[PDB]
Design an enzyme around this catalytic site. Structure first.
Site, PDB file in Angstrom:
ATOM      1  N   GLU A  83       0.816  -1.201   0.000  1.00 21.09           N
ATOM      2  CA  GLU A  83       0.000   0.000   0.000  1.00 21.09           C
ATOM      3  C   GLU A  83       0.852   1.255   0.000  1.00 21.09           C
ATOM      4  OE1 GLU A  83      -3.230   0.506  -0.288  1.00 21.09           O
ATOM      5  OE2 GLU A  83      -4.132  -1.427   0.076  1.00 21.09           O
ATOM      6  N   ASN A 102      -7.208   9.364  -5.611  1.00 19.21           N
ATOM      7  CA  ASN A 102      -8.117   8.500  -6.354  1.00 19.21           C
ATOM      8  C   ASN A 102      -8.953   9.247  -7.405  1.00 19.21           C
ATOM      9  OD1 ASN A 102      -8.318   7.319  -3.106  1.00 19.21           O
ATOM     10  ND2 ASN A 102      -7.433   6.067  -4.715  1.00 19.21           N
ATOM     11  N   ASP A 153      -5.665   8.778  -0.439  1.00 24.49           N
ATOM     12  CA  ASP A 153      -5.263   7.788   0.547  1.00 24.49           C
ATOM     13  C   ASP A 153      -3.985   8.271   1.244  1.00 24.49           C
ATOM     14  OD1 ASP A 153      -7.363   6.123  -0.348  1.00 24.49           O
ATOM     15  OD2 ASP A 153      -6.072   5.350  -1.899  1.00 24.49           O
ATOM     16  N   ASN A 185      -8.278   6.120   3.664  1.00 23.66           N
ATOM     17  CA  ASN A 185      -9.049   6.974   2.771  1.00 23.66           C
ATOM     18  C   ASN A 185      -9.782   8.155   3.366  1.00 23.66           C
ATOM     19  OD1 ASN A 185     -11.755   7.409   0.965  1.00 23.66           O
ATOM     20  ND2 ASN A 185     -10.028   6.954  -0.358  1.00 23.66           N
ATOM     21  N   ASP A 217     -14.793  -3.130  10.890  1.00 21.53           N
ATOM     22  CA  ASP A 217     -15.916  -2.685  10.039  1.00 21.53           C
ATOM     23  C   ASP A 217     -16.885  -3.721   9.447  1.00 21.53           C
ATOM     24  OD1 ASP A 217     -16.742   0.059   9.016  1.00 21.53           O
ATOM     25  OD2 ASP A 217     -16.706  -1.071   7.115  1.00 21.53           O
TER      26      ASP A 217
END
Length: 129
Positions: free
Chosen positions: A35, A46, A52, A59, A101
């Protein structure tokens, strides 16, 4: 700051990432690698306009506020620049919220496409953690 493999793994272990939510340490180091390339200052913009930030590429549309992403929920309630710090506490803490999440580490495209289903343990071998 650009971390070393083992250097980052020990830092994540100490911050409580090893097996956090069932994901062994190798997953987190593998994700960071693909990443951000272990670089705390990495930013990537993006197509939707969000950006990011950091080691774990968190994000701006959902987790942090960068003052330029409209409709940003800022779920981790923190300015995105806080995530580009040499100290990974903010990244790790927000990542914990992201991973809990319901979608797991699948939220990270690089983890999903390059770490998932691999010998992730190879990422921490040879490390004095």
């Amino acid at each position: 700051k650009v971390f070393g493999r083992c250097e980052l793994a020990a830092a994540m272990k100490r911050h409580g990432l090893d097996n956090y939510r069932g994901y062994s340490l190798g997953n987190w180091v593998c994700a960071a690698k693909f990443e951000s390339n272990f670089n705390t200052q990495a930013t990537n913009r993006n197509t939707d306009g969000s950006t990011d930030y950091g080691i774990l590429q968190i994000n701006s549309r959902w987790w942090c506020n960068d003052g330029r992403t409209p409709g940003s929920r800022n779920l981790c309630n923190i300015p995105c620049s806080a995530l580009l710090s040499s100290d990974i506490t903010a990244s790790v803490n927000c990542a914990k919220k992201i991973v809990s999440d319901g979608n797991g580490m699948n939220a990270w495209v690089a983890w999903r496409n390059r770490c998932k289903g691999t010998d992730v343990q190879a990422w921490i071998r040879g490390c004095r953690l």
